Amino acid sequence: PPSEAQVRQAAWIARCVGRGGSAPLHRDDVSALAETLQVKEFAPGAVVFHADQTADGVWIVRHGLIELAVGSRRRRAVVNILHPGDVDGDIPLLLEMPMVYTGRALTQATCLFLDRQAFERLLATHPAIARRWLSSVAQRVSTAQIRLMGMLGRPLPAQVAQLLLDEAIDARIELAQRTLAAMLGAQRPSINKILKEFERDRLITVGYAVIEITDQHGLRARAQ
Ligand SMILES: [Cl-]
């Protein structure tokens, strides 16, 4: 199974994925680039890109969900989920680093692919796209850095509160408790105890696979 450190590392690297306002390409530009971007379709379970391999280029999700995970297929830990509009591959390429997690289609999915040659050509010939990419990279890694900074030295319950608030999409968190624990350098039983307490105080609801935030203001106060 992947070590806690491998899971922690992959999960925080996966928090630098481009999304919404932070995405490196404007939607208008993704459209204009149709003859450069390759359309790639994935059945559920199919690999988009492998861990420990150099990025073949930049991936953009057009529809479906891509799971990001570490560990062998059997002992898999999911560290993040890419939604439509999300972009990955570009920061590792800029760091000259291999991917540290595997992306697998969760649902049927379609991804646009910008190969590394096309990427280099694009930045070299379209200064406006390059300039936006620069602000995007800065925004994405700085946002991750700010989340980490804010949790240092804080008691574990406050860290879990903050992590939940930051992870939430439409007030829902669908990550495993083992992964949440690894992100905080903690053990699953510790996270579970804190989640039970938050549940008793009516801050969250913990279903089978999902945590829902039921009182955001109350949870913010626990984050300190
Ligand atoms: Cl996998």
From Swiss-Prot:
Pfam family, any one: HTH_Crp_2
SMART domains registered for this protein in UniProt: cNMP (SM00100), HTH_CRP (SM00419)
UniProt GO MF annotations: DNA binding; DNA-binding transcription factor activity
Sequence ranges assigned to domain HTH crp-type in this UniProt record: 154-217
Disulfide bonds listed in the record: none
Residues noted as binding a nucleoside 3',5'-cyclic phosphate in the record, renumbered to the chain: 21-140
Entry keyword set: Activator, DNA-binding, Transcription, Transcription regulation
Keyword Nucleotide-binding belongs to the record: no
One of the record's GO cellular component terms: cytosol
Ranges annotated as DNA-binding: 177-196
Acetylation recorded as keyword: no
The protein's role, per its UniProt record: Positively regulates the expression of at least groEL2.
Name of the protein in its database record: HTH-type transcriptional regulator Cmr
Organism: Mycobacterium tuberculosis (strain CDC 1551 / Oshkosh)
